[PDB]
């Protein structure tokens, strides 16, 4: 009887403590909170702990106090949710960061293998996802239905963002390990190097061929963002070949500034200079020569640039 009277009224204290946690009632929580009830569970509903409730209802101060007074970040509700799940599911950024700083497991799994990132991503909590991913959330972990966190994002904008962030963090790690093959691999899949599937041209071939007056600024930008200055299309033409044959001198200067190989050979063994000579572009030939184009190079068909050009070209190429 004495052991049962204490337990019975202790069970009423609990319900009041849990109420104080959900409501945000600081004074009441601290009057009721002891070392013996800090990690109690509700008898009904989810069977949440005070910290689950504080976390879910964005009671930042209550969360802080609970953590300071021995609350367990690893405690489960009836479905295996930890308080990190609750915070993430309702987009409570500051709570999430606090729980993470006190050692909450970023990839904690409930009974259905839902992580906090599954919760954040499914409810469109974009900044929370970024924070989770920043703390080592793995968006390739699958739940019990085989679905990743990326699969649960309800908009393609969020999927795109989640994919960006996880790829970014993975690049950083690969860089720390000087994993040449893995950095080489992931940079190959960046859109800057996208190849037209038949013609094999990149954005840089397209830019230097453009008839629009911003072509110089576009080529400059592509090259700053990592475009291969010497990329070959199906015919082994570099952007330099493409520009020279059209007399697009402005973008030829950009290519030269970014270290274009002046004597790169197309599938006929021709340089950019052969192509400019053949088209009769006199100033283009002159520019190419000033950039170190070698006029002595003989094509697969047996011709130098001068042998393919008119008199004015032959003059340019000797003077």
């Amino acid at each position: 009887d004495p052991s049962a009277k204490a337990v019975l009224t202790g069970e009423y204290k609990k319900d009041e403590l849990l109420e104080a946690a959900r409501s945000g009632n600081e004074e009441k929580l601290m009057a009721l909170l002891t070392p013996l009830n800090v990690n109690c569970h509700a008898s009904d509903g989810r069977k949440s702990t005070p910290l689950h409730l504080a976390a879910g209802y964005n009671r930042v101060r209550i969360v802080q106090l609970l953590l300071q007074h021995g609350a367990d970040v690893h405690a489960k509700d009836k479905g295996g949710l930890v308080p990190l799940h609750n915070a993430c599911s309702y987009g409570h950024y500051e709570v999430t960061e606090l729980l993470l700083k006190h050692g909450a497991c970023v990839n904690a799994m409930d009974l259905w293998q839902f992580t906090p990132l599954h919760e954040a991503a499914s409810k469109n909590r974009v900044e929370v996802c970024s924070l989770l991913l920043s703390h080592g959330a793995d968006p390739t972990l699958v739940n019990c239905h085989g679905k990743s966190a990326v699969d649960m994002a309800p908009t393609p904008e969020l999927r795109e963002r989640l994919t960006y962030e996880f790829k970014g963090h993975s690049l950083l790690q690969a860089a720390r390990e000087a994993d040449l093959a893995k950095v080489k691999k992931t940079l190959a899949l960046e859109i800057i190097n996208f190849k037209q599937p038949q013609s094999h041209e990149t954005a840089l071939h397209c830019a230097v061929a453009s008839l629009h007056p911003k072509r110089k600024q576009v080529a400059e930008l592509l090259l700053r963002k990592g475009a291969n200055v010497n990329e070959k299309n199906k015919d082994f033409m570099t952007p330099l070949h493409v520009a020279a044959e059209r007399a697009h001198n402005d973008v030829m200067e950009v290519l030269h500034k970014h270290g274009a190989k002046m004597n790169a050979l197309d599938s006929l063994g021709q340089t950019a200079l052969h192509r400019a000579a053949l088209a009769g572009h006199l100033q283009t030939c002159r520019l190419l020569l000033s950039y170190g184009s070698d006029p002595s190079i003989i094509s697969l068909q047996g011709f130098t640039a001068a042998q393919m050009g008119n008199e004015a070209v032959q003059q340019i190429l000797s003077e």
Binding site: R22, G45, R46, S48, H52, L53, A55, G56, Y57, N58, D77, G79, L81, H85, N86, A87, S89, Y90, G91, H92, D110, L111, W112, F114, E119
Partner: peptide, 12 residues
Amino acid sequence: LARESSADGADS
């Protein structure tokens, strides 16, 4: 058997 799709908490 079926996962309850609501944890304790609410949007702020």
